[PDB]
Amino acid sequence: YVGVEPDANKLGVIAVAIEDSGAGDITFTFQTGTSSPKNATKVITLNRTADGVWACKSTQDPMFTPKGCDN
Amino acid sequence: FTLIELMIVVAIIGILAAIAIPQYQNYVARSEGASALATINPLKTTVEESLSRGIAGSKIKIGTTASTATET
């Protein structure tokens, strides 16, 4: 267990879904009512392939997307 | 109506006048300077943040146009 609650960050919940093959993603979905309207219902995904390659994908606006995460 | 009544009125009119009016343009000028400084002070944050994120200085303009990933 990662040691934190899904709602530890009030901005949104965190979901960890890793398959047995090693492929999976870690998502942070901003929740309406606790996040700014621009970032509401947006997802930041840390996708991991079965080969162990980590990539960051974000559905936010390109201006608001943090560095190192593709949009 | 008596002349003493009217002369007292004239005297009180003169007394109610002659109230010294101090300088007031200095207050307006100081307030204008403070307002201008408070208007342009937050623009330091915008320029510094845009330069920190790599946005070109020539791309930092003034206006209500929606800032993009390259223009601010």
| 3 state SS of A15 | strand
Which residue does chain A place closest to B70, by CA atoms?
A63
Instruction: Please give the C-alpha separations between residue B62 and each of A6, B45, B49, B54, in angstroms, as whole numbers.
Output: 41, 13, 15, 18
How far apart CA B59 and CA B51 sit, in angstroms, is 10
Asked if A52 has any chain B CB less than 8 Å from its own CB, the reply is: no
Resolution in A: 3.2
CA distances from A64 to A9, B3, B31, B39, B45 (A): 18, 83, 37, 25, 17
Residues of chain B positioned with their CB less than 8 A from the CB of A63: 67-69
Determine, for residues B67 and A63 on separate chains, whether the beta-carbon distance falls below 8 Å: yes
Q: Using CA coordinates, name the residue in chain A closest to B69.
A: A63
b/e map of B32-43 (b: 16 or more CB within 10 Å)? eeeeeeeeeeee
